[model samples]
Target: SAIKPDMKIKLRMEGNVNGHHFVIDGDGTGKPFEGKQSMDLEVKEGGPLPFAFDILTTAFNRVFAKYPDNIQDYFKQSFPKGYSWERSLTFEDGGICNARNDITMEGDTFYNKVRFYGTNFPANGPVMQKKTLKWEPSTEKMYVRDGVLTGDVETALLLEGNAHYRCDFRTTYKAKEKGVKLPGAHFVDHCIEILSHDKDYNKVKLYEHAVAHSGLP
Candidate 1:
């Protein structure tokens, strides 16, 4: 099948990662099409669990305090319905955690729903820790070539458990162009690292690396 330069290409994807479900709906148009995509995710029973809403609320309060006046208003205006963020953390006990958070606001209330999976803890494997803050958006850079779009994003956070984390995410999309019938894509080359920090509570140091990926197969 030959794709026209000005043709419109439709894209749809739905899949699961460790029992959690997600859907991506998007489309592309124009000579060198730029894809617009929206993703929705749902977490079922017992795969990975999130922290309490209050914990996130308190963390946001501190975060907002650091900013000047009404910084949260900017976020509210940008993400009216909500926003989703995902990142991974390495613990002092040689454990790694992959976490996802959905943040929303209602009147004067802030809500954050989280789902996470941990691996390789000292004694107990895959456990959630206390005083962990939701990952914050850091930076993202995206570029396109021929019909493929690639994006790289980074997120980081400081945990009250005396840990700091930084995670890198990359997504590549191949549009249905020229002779390609089905579009192919993948989220790969992702990693998470524990940054150097003070030894309090659970001391954590910069670790090697961790991996995660999701996309059409």
Candidate 2:
């Protein structure tokens, strides 16, 4: 029920997703530089690294509990990628587990949302959706008791940039406001910016006519 290491996070805000596009990479197209970019703030660290959470088991437990045997198999096939849903040991807080991610966008426009659980929880338990708590038994809310956000690299990761960016987060099941629907739930917000991207060597996508497609740089 507390903020652990294997959970989903939710977010909402107005920002940018403007990334540099290249005209010469593999198919004459460039991708956002993901390696070299830096962050203005950092997602506070919560649980430790190399965290352990059998995400597959958790989801399986949910699917198996709800769906029929045939549908259960179908669910797994439809969500193959979901199998590797390992816990992301991030620094969203200084204690317990939360969320973790590596890939953000900038210079765009739209409210964002995240959903992850850090601690090993029931798949049909309390869920954190749109800043609202819903009782899903296995699907619990991400949370931290007295958690706080420093948002140093975190801001940078989610700000408008020309390269790679990331906006990972996690709260707590209890942090959520009270008496909405679910038992434990909460809401968190992120910022957006249209500043320079953090690549190996900064360059304008317009003047360059192309962005670095490789890693960072």
Candidate 3:
């Protein structure tokens, strides 16, 4: 297809990350796109089993703290001297559109705004690790042209520079899923693409992004 100069074009680069789509615009508005975003994670039983995590927050600390002296002290001071309770604290960071898209020209770069949302999960021991180590997200749409790749443009969402994400969130709590409120954990983690620069080209501009992620509640 012949490329246009001032003409608009839409593209649907498949997602390689997770989260929701936040409307990126010149206006500083937090009103994200009405939909969930995509990611490279997968959910089977439904819950936070997607989103790849190196290890549960506590587990990471438990093992890493072995060598450090006063390991417990670190937890105490950092976690309020005596923490490890459960009250339910959400820690959603990578948001819908929580990821951003960037494009550049003549050193002028454009970045899609991002917003994130997270919540606490259950406090299961190592057994619960599997619940947090599953691949999640719809898909990561990587745009390419002239080397650069990103999701920023003023073209149609169906052009060659456009991208989309598909996701599914649960509303009804899982049978054993627990919320995060205890120490050593802030929120369930998922490696999401909040925002990133295109592959190689620098003159590309993204204007439209497709909303695809969904939730139960």
Best lDDT among the predictions, by candidate number:
1
TM-score of each: 0.31, 0.15, 0.18
Q: Top TM-score: which candidate number? A: 1
* Pairs in steric clash, model 1: none
Query: What are the Cα lDDT values of the candidates?
Result: 0.33, 0.20, 0.21
Question: Tell me, what's the RMSD of every candidate?
Answer: 16.1, 20.6, 22.3
Instruction: Kindly list the per-residue Cα lDDT of model 1 for residues 72-187, writing each as its tens digit.
Output: 22222323354444554444446554655455544433344544444454333222344554445333343444654444665545666666554454433232123333222322
Candidate 3: RMSD to truth: 22.3
lDDT tens digits, residue span 83-130, model 2: 112233332222123332221222221111333343432233221111
What is the Cα-based TM-score of model 2?
0.15
lDDT tens per residue, model 3, 91-152: 23222222211211111111222222332323332222222322222232223334322222
Point out the worst 10-residue segment of candidate 1 by lDDT.
57-66
Once fitted onto the true fold, the runs of candidate 1 whose alpha carbons sit more than 4 angstroms away are 1-43, 47-127, 145-147, 161-163, 176-217
Q: Alpha carbon lDDT of residue 70, candidate 1?
A: 18
The model with the greater TM-score, 1 or 2, is 1
User: Cα miss at 35, model 3 (Å)?
Assistant: 19
